[PDB]
Design a binder for this molecule. Sequence first.
Ligand SMILES: [K+]
Ligand SMILES: [Mg+2]
Ligand SMILES: [Mg+2]
Ligand SMILES: [Mg+2]
Ligand SMILES: [Mg+2]
Ligand SMILES: [Mg+2]
Ligand SMILES: [Mg+2]
Ligand SMILES: [Mg+2]
Ligand SMILES: [Mg+2]
Ligand SMILES: [Mg+2]
Ligand SMILES: [Mg+2]
Ligand SMILES: [Mg+2]
Ligand SMILES: [Mg+2]
Ligand SMILES: [Mg+2]
Ligand SMILES: [Mg+2]
Ligand SMILES: [Mg+2]
Ligand SMILES: [Mg+2]
Ligand SMILES: [Mg+2]
Ligand SMILES: [Mg+2]
Ligand SMILES: [Mg+2]
Ligand SMILES: [Mg+2]
Ligand SMILES: [Mg+2]
Ligand SMILES: [Mg+2]
Ligand SMILES: [Mg+2]
Ligand SMILES: [Mg+2]
Ligand SMILES: [Mg+2]
Ligand SMILES: [Mg+2]
Ligand SMILES: [Mg+2]
Ligand SMILES: [Mg+2]
Ligand SMILES: [Mg+2]
Ligand SMILES: [Mg+2]
Ligand SMILES: [Mg+2]
Ligand SMILES: [Mg+2]
Ligand SMILES: [Mg+2]
Ligand SMILES: [Mg+2]
Ligand SMILES: [Mg+2]
Ligand SMILES: [Mg+2]
Ligand SMILES: [Mg+2]
Ligand SMILES: [Mg+2]
Ligand SMILES: [Mg+2]
Ligand SMILES: [Mg+2]
Ligand SMILES: [Mg+2]
Ligand SMILES: [Mg+2]
Ligand SMILES: [Mg+2]
Ligand SMILES: [Mg+2]
Ligand SMILES: [Mg+2]
Ligand SMILES: [Mg+2]
Ligand SMILES: [Mg+2]
Ligand SMILES: [Mg+2]
Ligand SMILES: [Mg+2]
Ligand SMILES: [Mg+2]
Ligand SMILES: [Mg+2]
Ligand SMILES: [Mg+2]
Ligand SMILES: [Mg+2]
Ligand SMILES: [Mg+2]
Ligand SMILES: [Mg+2]
Ligand SMILES: [Mg+2]
Ligand SMILES: [Mg+2]
Ligand SMILES: [Mg+2]
Ligand SMILES: [Mg+2]
Ligand SMILES: [Mg+2]
Ligand SMILES: [Mg+2]
Ligand SMILES: [Mg+2]
Ligand SMILES: [Mg+2]
Ligand SMILES: [Mg+2]
Ligand SMILES: [Mg+2]
Ligand SMILES: [Mg+2]
Ligand SMILES: [Mg+2]
Ligand SMILES: [Mg+2]
Ligand SMILES: [Mg+2]
Ligand SMILES: [Mg+2]
Ligand SMILES: [Mg+2]
Ligand SMILES: [Mg+2]
Ligand SMILES: [Mg+2]
Ligand SMILES: [Mg+2]
Ligand SMILES: [Mg+2]
Ligand SMILES: [Mg+2]
Ligand SMILES: [Mg+2]
Ligand SMILES: [Mg+2]
Ligand SMILES: [Mg+2]
Ligand SMILES: [Mg+2]
Ligand SMILES: [Mg+2]
Ligand SMILES: [Mg+2]
Ligand SMILES: [Mg+2]
Ligand SMILES: [Mg+2]
Ligand SMILES: [Mg+2]
Ligand SMILES: [Mg+2]
Ligand SMILES: [Mg+2]
Ligand SMILES: [Mg+2]
Ligand SMILES: [Mg+2]
Ligand SMILES: [Mg+2]
Ligand SMILES: [Mg+2]
Ligand SMILES: [Mg+2]
Ligand SMILES: [Mg+2]
Ligand SMILES: [Mg+2]
Ligand SMILES: [Mg+2]
Ligand SMILES: [Mg+2]
Ligand SMILES: [Mg+2]
Ligand SMILES: [Mg+2]
Ligand SMILES: [Mg+2]
Ligand SMILES: [Mg+2]
Ligand SMILES: [Mg+2]
Ligand SMILES: [Mg+2]
Ligand SMILES: [Mg+2]
Ligand SMILES: [Mg+2]
Ligand SMILES: [Mg+2]
Ligand SMILES: [Mg+2]
Ligand SMILES: [Mg+2]
Ligand SMILES: [Mg+2]
Ligand SMILES: [Mg+2]
Ligand SMILES: [Mg+2]
Ligand SMILES: [Mg+2]
Lengths: 116, 75, 92, 56, 136
Amino acid sequence: DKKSARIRRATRARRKLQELGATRLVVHRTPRHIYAQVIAPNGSEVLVAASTVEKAIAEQLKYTGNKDAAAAVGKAVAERALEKGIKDVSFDRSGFQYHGRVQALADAAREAGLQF
Amino acid sequence: TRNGRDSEAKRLGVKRFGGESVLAGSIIVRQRGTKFHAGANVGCGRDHTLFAKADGKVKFEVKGPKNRKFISIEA
Amino acid sequence: FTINAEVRKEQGKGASRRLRAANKFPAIIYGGKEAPLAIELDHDKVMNMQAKAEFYSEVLTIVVDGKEIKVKAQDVQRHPYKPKLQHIDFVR
Amino acid sequence: KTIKITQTRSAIGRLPKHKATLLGLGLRRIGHTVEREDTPAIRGMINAVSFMVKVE
Amino acid sequence: MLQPKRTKFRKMHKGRNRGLAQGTDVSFGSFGLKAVGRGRLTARQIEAARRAMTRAVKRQGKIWIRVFPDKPITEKPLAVRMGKGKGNVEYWVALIQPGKVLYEMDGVPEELAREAFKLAAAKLPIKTTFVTKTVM
RNA sequence: GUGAAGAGGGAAACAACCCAGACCGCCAGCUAAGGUCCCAAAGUCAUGGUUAAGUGGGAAACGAUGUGGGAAGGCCCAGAC
RNA sequence: UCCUCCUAAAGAGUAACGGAGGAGCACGAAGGUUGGCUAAUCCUGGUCGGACAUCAGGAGGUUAGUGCAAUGGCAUAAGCC
RNA sequence: GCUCAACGGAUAAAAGGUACUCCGGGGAUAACAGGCUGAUACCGCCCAAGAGUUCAUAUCGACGGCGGUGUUUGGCACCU
RNA sequence: UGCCUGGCGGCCGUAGCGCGGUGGUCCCACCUGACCCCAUGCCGAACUCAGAAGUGAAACGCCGUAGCGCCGAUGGUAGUGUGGGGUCUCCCCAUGCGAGAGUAGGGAACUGCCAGGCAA
Ligand SMILES: [K+]
Ligand SMILES: [Mg+2]
Ligand SMILES: [Mg+2]
Ligand SMILES: [Mg+2]
Ligand SMILES: [Mg+2]
Ligand SMILES: [Mg+2]
Ligand SMILES: [Mg+2]
Ligand SMILES: [Mg+2]
Ligand SMILES: [Mg+2]
Ligand SMILES: [Mg+2]
Ligand SMILES: [Mg+2]
Ligand SMILES: [Mg+2]
Ligand SMILES: [Mg+2]
Ligand SMILES: [Mg+2]
Ligand SMILES: [Mg+2]
Ligand SMILES: [Mg+2]
Ligand SMILES: [Mg+2]
Ligand SMILES: [Mg+2]
Ligand SMILES: [Mg+2]
Ligand SMILES: [Mg+2]
Ligand SMILES: [Mg+2]
Ligand SMILES: [Mg+2]
Ligand SMILES: [Mg+2]
Ligand SMILES: [Mg+2]
Ligand SMILES: [Mg+2]
Ligand SMILES: [Mg+2]
Ligand SMILES: [Mg+2]
Ligand SMILES: [Mg+2]
Ligand SMILES: [Mg+2]
Ligand SMILES: [Mg+2]
Ligand SMILES: [Mg+2]
Ligand SMILES: [Mg+2]
Ligand SMILES: [Mg+2]
Ligand SMILES: [Mg+2]
Ligand SMILES: [Mg+2]
Ligand SMILES: [Mg+2]
Ligand SMILES: [Mg+2]
Ligand SMILES: [Mg+2]
Ligand SMILES: [Mg+2]
Ligand SMILES: [Mg+2]
Ligand SMILES: [Mg+2]
Ligand SMILES: [Mg+2]
Ligand SMILES: [Mg+2]
Ligand SMILES: [Mg+2]
Ligand SMILES: [Mg+2]
Ligand SMILES: [Mg+2]
Ligand SMILES: [Mg+2]
Ligand SMILES: [Mg+2]
Ligand SMILES: [Mg+2]
Ligand SMILES: [Mg+2]
Ligand SMILES: [Mg+2]
Ligand SMILES: [Mg+2]
Ligand SMILES: [Mg+2]
Ligand SMILES: [Mg+2]
Ligand SMILES: [Mg+2]
Ligand SMILES: [Mg+2]
Ligand SMILES: [Mg+2]
Ligand SMILES: [Mg+2]
Ligand SMILES: [Mg+2]
Ligand SMILES: [Mg+2]
Ligand SMILES: [Mg+2]
Ligand SMILES: [Mg+2]
Ligand SMILES: [Mg+2]
Ligand SMILES: [Mg+2]
Ligand SMILES: [Mg+2]
Ligand SMILES: [Mg+2]
Ligand SMILES: [Mg+2]
Ligand SMILES: [Mg+2]
Ligand SMILES: [Mg+2]
Ligand SMILES: [Mg+2]
Ligand SMILES: [Mg+2]
Ligand SMILES: [Mg+2]
Ligand SMILES: [Mg+2]
Ligand SMILES: [Mg+2]
Ligand SMILES: [Mg+2]
Ligand SMILES: [Mg+2]
Ligand SMILES: [Mg+2]
Ligand SMILES: [Mg+2]
Ligand SMILES: [Mg+2]
Ligand SMILES: [Mg+2]
Ligand SMILES: [Mg+2]
Ligand SMILES: [Mg+2]
Ligand SMILES: [Mg+2]
Ligand SMILES: [Mg+2]
Ligand SMILES: [Mg+2]
Ligand SMILES: [Mg+2]
Ligand SMILES: [Mg+2]
Ligand SMILES: [Mg+2]
Ligand SMILES: [Mg+2]
Ligand SMILES: [Mg+2]
Ligand SMILES: [Mg+2]
Ligand SMILES: [Mg+2]
Ligand SMILES: [Mg+2]
Ligand SMILES: [Mg+2]
Ligand SMILES: [Mg+2]
Ligand SMILES: [Mg+2]
Ligand SMILES: [Mg+2]
Ligand SMILES: [Mg+2]
Ligand SMILES: [Mg+2]
Ligand SMILES: [Mg+2]
Ligand SMILES: [Mg+2]
Ligand SMILES: [Mg+2]
Ligand SMILES: [Mg+2]
Ligand SMILES: [Mg+2]
Ligand SMILES: [Mg+2]
Ligand SMILES: [Mg+2]
Ligand SMILES: [Mg+2]
Ligand SMILES: [Mg+2]
Ligand SMILES: [Mg+2]
Ligand SMILES: [Mg+2]
Ligand SMILES: [Mg+2]
Ligand SMILES: [Mg+2]
């Protein structure tokens, strides 16, 4: 199984991050689509969430699953996050190597204004 | 005889118990491995010593997938 | 295969030994949706009853407060060395 | 409602807990009729040293 | 003479032989020799009582030995003072609480199974009794 | 826990056991542990049993139709031993 | 002298010429930290290749590993690159 | 910069003999005997695989068991 | 509102296995290509990137079935604090605490918060 190997590869970050009690930006990548959501320090309730699965963002782009699409979500999440009052967060890469789409998402989240 | 040696005793155990008020820095458990684990506002030093990181009352819990004992503090 | 038996009121170590040193011994009846029933009964009867192989197979009707309850012996505790019973579990 | 307690044995070859419990009841010597306010606690103390006290 | 083939530790503490036994029911064979008394059976006693049964019932029948020693007993040599180490393991014993079935027989008559167990019981230190495999 | 450093009463005599902690006096009373036929204070008390061994008043494996108290089995006036 | 286990009577501590074992160092990476990994023993199949090198699969689920004894620990791995 | 490892390290630096012995002490501690214990010892007994011309118990008894004595070799260190 | 599936927590086995059936419009997974970003101590199996031809085969979900695992009374039993008694290397009364194992059975989990599609 791959999934299980990705979960336990992520777990160390998650468990270290919930101990600090910080608001984490989870980013679940997929062959088709890229997701992102800001979750409260308790871990249960979600404050902000955005993805290429949302038609509001899907209608605009060429294809839902690439660097330019990840930047569009990375902009979107951070654009909502500032309206809610969120600013200082952390970035949970969620078992995905910080390199391509998630790096584009993070860089777009930084460049949008979300200071982390 | 052939044997008759022994080490000095290490005074390991739960120093502060559940429900006990402790000050920031107070050692809660001296022990070898992580028989107890660090929860909320509790540290875990090089000796695996669990110590209070904030002033409050000690709380023992049994939580996790593998069902381990955690020590937390709540103010 | 019909035995009269009384309902227990005191139950524990202290009561059961007082009872067991008075030619009687504790048993219990349980089964179905109904609650369990703790049942004091005489030793010298049930000791002679168990010699037959039918006792640990066939249905017994235990008489309690008038009412005859149908049961089978599910489990039984022998005394360690002396030839005598300590306790019987009657499934309904 | 008060309960009259009486010490009916010596407190000589007794455990420190039992020597304490009689000090907690206020019993000093054998044949000392002390009356105390009936609570769950005092009945616990009387229960602890029941062998050497008598209740009225 | 029965003895454990290899052990973790050579010498064991004395301990205390308290409580009731656990192998009370006659499990394998038809009949059995139950220990009424309390004590400890040496390796020699077991073999001695086994030989007395085996030879009474002849080639016919089958015997079980429910007890096994696995407890080494030390003993200090003659004219040796106290201390200067724990003594040397001489013999091996099985601790026997009341209720313990020691031996069990099978494939013999009831009248001739008893006569065999008397001869065994004569070898043992502990007070014993005859027991039959009942149901439940 | 006691003695040590605690006297008194009992355990025949007996620091360490049981009872109980002596401030002094009294030819008063109630008790504890032990007891209550005589030595020796107090029941030759009452009641219902059990022991024939001086058991009680030293000792085990085993050995015995000693002798109570139960609970079952045998199997018979076609008279069972 | 020092460390580990029991003795040690479920806090700590606890003796004997009690029962069993170790230490008097190692390491510039065997430390730090970021990124990845996941183990023994099998059973199969496979050039020499055997009871056992390497490869491929399965079954296993930490039965391993941890610089050194033992105990407590380690999968978020403190194990392995 | 110390196996000051007798590891809270007496000195920087130290082994023996004494039946030629001596003083202070000790029944805090041995040898003698007493005591407690009874492993051992000795003395009994229980079970009966075996002897017997066969036929356990005339007579002895394997394997095992249980006592008694204080009684040897002891243990302990309570008296001196 | 329900039906779905993702993400993320609570709960940690009544929550896990084996077993049988199923899902593919989306969703998800395998998948398709590797000039590139980046990757193997060899290998696009991983990790990564670009995509949408197929598929639901395996995975993952999901519903079923007690073959296992697990949960688990009541009564008893064992221990045992206190105080007493024995025939005292063991036990027994009085009084409180009371297992473990094993039965009768329960059991194919239960829910939070967003987020998308589908009968309303
Ligand atoms: K001490
Ligand atoms: Mg890591
Ligand atoms: Mg949409
Ligand atoms: Mg020592
Ligand atoms: Mg130690
Ligand atoms: Mg020590
Ligand atoms: Mg020291
Ligand atoms: Mg540190
Ligand atoms: Mg007094
Ligand atoms: Mg006393
Ligand atoms: Mg006074
Ligand atoms: Mg006075
Ligand atoms: Mg012990
Ligand atoms: Mg046992
Ligand atoms: Mg059992
Ligand atoms: Mg020596
Ligand atoms: Mg005294
Ligand atoms: Mg003095
Ligand atoms: Mg006195
Ligand atoms: Mg006196
Ligand atoms: Mg006397
Ligand atoms: Mg007298
Ligand atoms: Mg006197
Ligand atoms: Mg005295
Ligand atoms: Mg007394
Ligand atoms: Mg006084
Ligand atoms: Mg006075
Ligand atoms: Mg009077
Ligand atoms: Mg009176
Ligand atoms: Mg009395
Ligand atoms: Mg009296
Ligand atoms: Mg008189
Ligand atoms: Mg008189
Ligand atoms: Mg008269
Ligand atoms: Mg008269
Ligand atoms: Mg009279
Ligand atoms: Mg009379
Ligand atoms: Mg009479
Ligand atoms: Mg008479
Ligand atoms: Mg006499
Ligand atoms: Mg006598
Ligand atoms: Mg006879
Ligand atoms: Mg007669
Ligand atoms: Mg008579
Ligand atoms: Mg009777
Ligand atoms: Mg301990
Ligand atoms: Mg301890
Ligand atoms: Mg303790
Ligand atoms: Mg000491
Ligand atoms: Mg050494
Ligand atoms: Mg070094
Ligand atoms: Mg390196
Ligand atoms: Mg590190
Ligand atoms: Mg498999
Ligand atoms: Mg290991
Ligand atoms: Mg090891
Ligand atoms: Mg490391
Ligand atoms: Mg590691
Ligand atoms: Mg110098
Ligand atoms: Mg030296
Ligand atoms: Mg020194
Ligand atoms: Mg020193
Ligand atoms: Mg020191
Ligand atoms: Mg010195
Ligand atoms: Mg010096
Ligand atoms: Mg020098
Ligand atoms: Mg000399
Ligand atoms: Mg000389
Ligand atoms: Mg001279
Ligand atoms: Mg001199
Ligand atoms: Mg002199
Ligand atoms: Mg002396
Ligand atoms: Mg000395
Ligand atoms: Mg001599
Ligand atoms: Mg002497
Ligand atoms: Mg004597
Ligand atoms: Mg003797
Ligand atoms: Mg012999
Ligand atoms: Mg013997
Ligand atoms: Mg002699
Ligand atoms: Mg002698
Ligand atoms: Mg000495
Ligand atoms: Mg001494
Ligand atoms: Mg003298
Ligand atoms: Mg599931
Ligand atoms: Mg399936
Ligand atoms: Mg299948
Ligand atoms: Mg299909
Ligand atoms: Mg199918
Ligand atoms: Mg679509
Ligand atoms: Mg491919
Ligand atoms: Mg791929
Ligand atoms: Mg499928
Ligand atoms: Mg298939
Ligand atoms: Mg459902
Ligand atoms: Mg069902
Ligand atoms: Mg079924
Ligand atoms: Mg069913
Ligand atoms: Mg209930
Ligand atoms: Mg007591
Ligand atoms: Mg007691
Ligand atoms: Mg009493
Ligand atoms: Mg008495
Ligand atoms: Mg006595
Ligand atoms: Mg219960
Ligand atoms: Mg239970
Ligand atoms: Mg259970
Ligand atoms: Mg069942
Ligand atoms: Mg069922
Ligand atoms: Mg479900
Ligand atoms: Mg539901
Ligand atoms: Mg809601």
